[PDB]
From a paper:
Here, we report the first structure of glycerol kinase from the thermophilic filamentous fungus Chaetomium thermophilum (CtGK). Glycerol kinase (EC 2.7.1.30) catalyzes the transfer of phosphate moiety from ATP to glycerol to form glycerol 3-phosphate (G3P). Overall, the CtGK polypeptide chain can be divided into two distinct domains classified by Pfam as FGGY_N (residues 65–325) and FGGY_C (residues 331–583) connected by a flexible region. A similar case is found in CtGK, which forms extended dimers via the interaction between the C-terminal domains with a prominent contribution from hydrophobic residues (Phe422, Gly436, Phe389, Leu394, Thr437, Phe439, Gly440, Ile441, Thr437, Thr445, Leu438, Ile450, Trp580).
Subsequently, by replacing the cryoprotectant solution with 20–25% glycerol, we were able to solve the enzyme-substrate complex with a clear electron density that could be attributed to the bound glycerol moiety. In total, three different crystal structures were obtained in the presence of glycerol, constituting 13 polypeptide chains. Generally, the same extent of the chain could be modeled as in the apo structures, i.e., for residues 65–583 with an approximate 9aa gap between H18 and B18. The substrate is bound in an evolutionarily conserved cleft within the N-terminal domain that opens towards the C-terminal domain. The glycerol molecule is coordinated by polar interactions with side chains of Glu149, Arg 148, Asp317, Gln318, and additionally with Arg148 main-chain amide. The carbon chain of glycerol packs against hydrophobic Trp168 and Phe342. A similar mode of binding was described previously for P. falciparum GK, where Phe271 and Tyr135 undergo shift upon substrate or cofactor binding. However, the movement of equivalent residues (Phe342 and Tyr200) was not observed in either of the presented CtGK complexes. Of note, we solved and refined five CtGK structures, and each of them belongs to a different space group, despite crystals having grown in the same buffer condition. We observed that in the absence of nucleotide, CtGK adopts open conformation, which upon nucleotide binding closes up.
Author numbering:
A (entry chain A), B (entry chain A): 65 to 541, 551 to 582
Write the structure that this text describes.
C-alpha cells in the first residue's frame, strides 16, 4: 500500500485527493455543494449533502485513479480534514440526522451568547478550553438546537441524540454508521478543541464546561476524543470504491494546512489567504492562553507515545476583500492579476497607508469604531500607491498577529508558510518577508490542506515513520521569498502602519 | 456715452470687455500670454507683455464692437482690474521697465521672509496693514529686487526708480507714460492694501511699514493712493482705439469679483473657484483684523463722500484640484462633467469624508502635518461616495472659512455669490446651500470679475448713480440654490467633517 487518500470536506466544497509517497496528488475530484441560508445570518447545510459530496468525490477520483492502472489496493489509508465547529446532530441509534448542520459562520446564536457571557461563571472558560465565547464554537450552536428544535429536545432527553463536528459525522457514516460491526463515533483532538467542551490541557472533556452549557454526558452521546493520527481508532471505509481501506488520520482544516506545510516546530507558522486570513502558530507541547484575544488550540495530536502540540490562532477579515474592494468599488482593474500589476507599477507606497478596517479591526487591535481609512494622499498619489498600500495592509496585519503570537508563546517566529488567494502575488509575499524579517514559504503543490490529512494517515500506517521524514519526502517532486529590504526602512513602514491604526480609532459615533 | 469698458489683466490672460447699461458684455477679446519661470518657484512676467496683451485685447474687441456699428463714442469710461501683489519696477523718468515683473505666487523671497519675520518688530505689522507677512505681498518682492538686481539698486538711490502693482503700471502706460501732459502714477485703495506699505485704517501710507522694509519715500517713487472709483484721478487712454476715453475705475481682481456680484452689504460674500478658492467677505466700513489668519483688506473705495468698505479674505488650496485628483490620479472619470455625474449617482456620501489636505490645511485650521485623508470606507463605499465627498470637502472648507469670517466681523453671513470652476456643478452649489444655510447665487453672465471694474467706472461717470441702482440694473437681461436639507442632518455632516479634520492632525513626522 503506497498511496494515501485525503478527504477535504470544506465550507463550500468537498474534494478527495490521492497522493503518492512524495506528496504529489495523482487523482482528485471536487464538488461545490449546496449551502442553505434560511434567513439572513443563518447558515445551514444538509448533513447528507456533505457526506454524499465526499463520497462522490471518492467515486470520481477513483475513476481517474483507475485510469492509470491503480486500484483500491494501492491506497494504504486515508485522512479526513474538515471545516471546523460546524455542528451535526444525529440519532445515536438510527444514524439519521435530526436537523440540518449549523455551519460555523452562523450567527443565529447571537441573541444567546449574550445570556451565557452574562453568566458571571463564563470567563475562566477561556483558560479552560482556549476559546473566547463566540457565535462560532459548536457548544453554543448545539445549545441553540437543544432549545429551539423539538426533535433535538426530544432525542436529547430520550438518551437518543448524538453530536459531532463534521469530522466525526464523516467518520461515523463512512464506517457504516449504526450498521457497522464496530460503530465509530470519534473525534480528533484538534476538532475537539473547537467545541469549548474539551479541556485544552487534558485533551479530554471537562465537566465544568459541559456544566455551564448544561450538557449532560449521559443523555447526549459525545464522540470519544482520539488522536489526530491513530492506526485503528477511526476504523475503515465500509462501502464504495475504498471499501476496507482504513481511515488513519483526522484533522481540523486550518490545523491540517499547518501540518501540510510541515510547520512542526515552534515558531513555524502558516497563513491561508482567502477573503481574509487564517493564521496558525505552533507553540510546542504546552498550551498557551493569549493576552491578545487569539485562540488557543491543538495543532495536531499524532499519539504513538508523543505529546500533543498546541497552537495559537488569529484571523484577518480583509485580505482578498481589499483586492476585491479596489476592483469592484474603485474600478482600478478588472482582475486580481492586474490589481497586482498596478501595485508593482510604482517603486513604493508613496507614503500611503490604508487601514482596511471595513468592519473594524480584530486580533490583536480589537478596534470596533474604525472604518477603512486612507492616509498619506497627495496630488502625487497614484492608483499604484493605493494598490500597493492595500496589499501592504494585509502584510501589516499578518505581522501584527505574528508579533502578538510571539509575545504569547515566548518562541521566536522562524518561518511563515502561505497558501491560497493573495499568497499568489509575488509582491505581497516579498513584502511579508521584508516586513516580518523571516523567509516566507509558498509551495507550488496547490493542495496543502488535503496534504495534512494524508500526512497524519501516512504516519499512523508507516508510509512515513518520523516527521523529519515528512518534510524531506514532500520536497522531492518562485517558492521562497527572502527579506531584501533593510530593517531600518522595514520598521518605518510598520510604525507608519501603527500610527495609522492609532489614528483610525474612534471614527464612528 | 452708454457703454462701459473693462480691462481684466489676469495671472495667465488678459481680456477687455464692453458692457451695456444692463451689464451684459457685447464685445470681448482674450489673450493667453507668456509666463516665465526662470528657476523652480520663480514666477516672472515681462511688463510689456502685460501691457501689450491688454492693448491688443482692446484692439480686437473694438474690431468686433465696430462690427455692430458702435464706435469709441459709445464708451463713456473704462475700468481696470488686475491680478494683485504682482510687482512692477520702472524708471520714474523714462517709463522703461527696470526688470521683469515678479508675479504674486513667486517664492524667491522665501529665504528673506525669514529674516524679516525674524526682526521682532514684525508682528504689529498685522494690525497696521491687515496682512500676515508672506512671500505674497509686493513689499517683500520689491525688497528682494532692490537687493539682488543692480539696475534696481542703482535706479532706487538715484531718485529714479518707480514702483507699482499691475493696476498702476497699466494706468501709467495707458495715459501715455512719461510723455503724457498729466502723468498718472496712481493706485486704488484695494490694490494699495495688498502691498503692506499702506495703513488699513488710513488708506494712506504708514511710515512704520515703509520703515521696517527700509523703503525711503523720497528715492522710491510711489503711486498716489486714490479711490477705486474716481472721475478723474486715473486720466484717460492716450493712444489706440479708445483714445480720449477716461479711465474711471480700478480694482484688485478678487475685490472686483465681489463688486461684480453686488455684495455691497456686510455678510454678503463671494467665492471664486479654480484649482482652489478665493473667498471675499464684506465687513462694512471699519477694518477688522482676524484672529484666524484671514487677511484684512479693502473691499472697495468708491469715494464721492462715501467711506471705504473693508473685507476679510481666505483661500483654499484644493477645490478644482480635488476633481483633477479623482480624474488624473484615480481614473474615476475623464472630464469634470462626469466626476460630477459620479457624485450624483448616489444618494449621499455613504459616510465618507475626504480631508483633502494634500499640502496640509490653511485658513482657519492651519494644519501643516496632515496629508489627504479618507475616512468612512467600507465594502459598500463606491466611486460615487468618494466623488461626492470630494465635492463636499470644498463646501466644508468654504463653510469653515465663512464661519471664521463671521466670528471676526460680528456680521451674520447673508449670501454667498459664486463664479468659476467648481461653481458650475449643480450638486456642489446645492451642497453649499445645505451646509451653510444661506442662499448661494450663481450668475449666468460669465465675466463677473471684469464686471466689477466696469461698475466702478460707471459710478464715477454716472452710468449708474447709486449702488442700489447697480444690482437692479444688472439683473435685467439654474442661478440661485436654496438650502433643502434639514439643519439637523446639515450639522451632523459638518461635525463629521470637523472630527475628520481633527483626526488628520499629526500624520507626517
Amino acid at each position: 500500500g503506497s498511496f494515501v487518500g485525503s478527504i477535504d470536506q470544506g465550507t463550500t466544497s468537498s474534494r478527495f485527493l490521492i497522493f503518492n509517497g512524495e506528496g504529489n496528488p495523482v487523482a482528485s475530484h471536487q464538488i461545490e455543494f449546496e449551502n442553505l441560508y434560511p434567513k439572513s445570518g443563518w447558515h445551514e447545510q444538509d448533513p447528507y449533502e456533505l457526506l454524499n459530496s465526499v463520497q462522490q468525490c471518492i467515486d470520481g477520483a477513483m475513476h481517474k485513479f483507475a485510469s492509470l492502472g491503480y486500484s483500491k489496493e494501492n491506497i494504504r489509508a486515508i485522512g479526513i480534514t474538515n471545516q471546523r465547529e460546524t455542528t451535526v446532530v444525529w440519532d445515536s441509534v438510527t444514524g439519521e440526522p435530526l436537523h440540518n448542520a449549523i455551519v460555523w459562520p452562523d450567527t443565529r446564536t447571537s441573541a444567546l451568547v449574550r445570556e451565557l457571557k452574562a453568566r458571571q461563571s463564563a470567563d475562566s472558560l477561556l483558560e479552560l478550553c482556549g476559546l473566547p465565547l463566540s457565535t462560532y464554537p459548536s457548544s453554543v450552536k448545539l445549545l441553540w438546537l437543544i432549545q429551539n428544535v423539538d426533535a433535538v429536545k426530544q432525542a436529547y432527553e430520550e438518551g437518543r441524540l448524538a453530536f459531532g463536528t463534521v469530522d466525526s459525522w464523516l467518520i461515523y457514516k463512512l464506517n457504516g454508521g449504526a450498521q457497522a460491526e464496530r460503530p465509530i463515533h470519534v473525534t480528533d483532538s484538534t476538532n475537539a478543541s473547537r467545541t469549548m467542551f474539551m479541556n485544552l490541557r487534558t485533551l479530554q472533556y471537562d465537566d465544568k464546561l459541559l456544566g455551564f452549557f448544561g450538557i449532560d454526558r449521559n443523555k447526549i452521546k459525545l464522540p470519544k476524543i482520539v488522536p489526530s493520527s491513530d492506526p485503528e481508532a477511526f476504523g475503515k471505509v465500509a462501502t464504495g470504491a475504498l471499501a476496507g481501506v482504513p481511515i488513519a488520520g483526522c484533522l481540523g482544516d486550518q490545523s491540517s494546512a499547518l501540518v501540510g506545510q510541515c510547520g512542526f516546530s515552534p515558531g513555524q507558522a502558516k497563513n491561508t489567504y482567502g477573503t481574509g486570513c487564517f493564521l496558525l502558530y505552533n507553540v510546542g507541547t504546552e498550551p498557551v492562553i493569549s493576552k491578545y484575544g487569539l485562540l488557543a488550540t491543538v495543532a495536531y495530536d499524532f499519539g504513538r507515545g508523543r505529546k500533543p502540540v498546541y497552537a495559537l490562532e488569529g484571523s484577518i477579515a480583509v485580505a482578498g476583500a481589499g483586492i476585491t474592494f479596489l476592483m469592484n468599488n474603485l474600478g482600478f482593474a478588472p482582475k486580481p492579476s492586474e490589481i497586482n500589476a498596478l501595485a508593482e507599477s510604482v517603486l513604493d507606497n508613496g507614503g500611503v497607508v490604508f487601514v482596511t478596517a471595513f468592519s473594524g479591526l480584530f486580533a490583536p487591535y480589537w478596534i470596533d469604531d474604525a472604518k477603512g481609512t486612507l492616509f498619506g494622499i497627495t496630488q502625487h498619489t497614484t492608483k499604484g500607491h493605493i494598490a500597493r498600500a492595500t496589499l501592504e495592509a494585509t502584510c501589516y496585519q499578518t505581522r501584527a498577529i505574528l508579533d502578538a503570537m510571539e509575545k504569547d508563546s515566548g518562541h521566536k517566529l522562524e518561518s511563515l508558510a502561505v497558501d491560497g488567494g493573495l499568497s499568489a502575488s509575488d509582491l505581497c509575499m516579498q513584502t511579508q518577508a521584508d516586513i516580518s524579517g523571516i523567509p516566507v514559504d509558498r509551495p507550488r503543490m496547490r493542495e496543502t490542506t488535503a496534504l495534512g490529512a494524508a500526512i497524519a494517515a501516512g504516519l499512523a500506517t508507516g508510509v512515513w515513520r518520523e516527521l523529519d521524514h515528512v518534510k524531506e519526502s514532500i520536497a522531492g517532486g518562485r517558492e521562497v521569498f527572502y527579506p531584501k529590504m533593510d530593517r531600518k526602512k522595514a520598521e518605518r513602514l510598520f510604525r507608519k502602519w501603527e500610527q495609522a491604526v492609532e489614528m483610525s480609532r474612534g471614527w464612528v459615533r
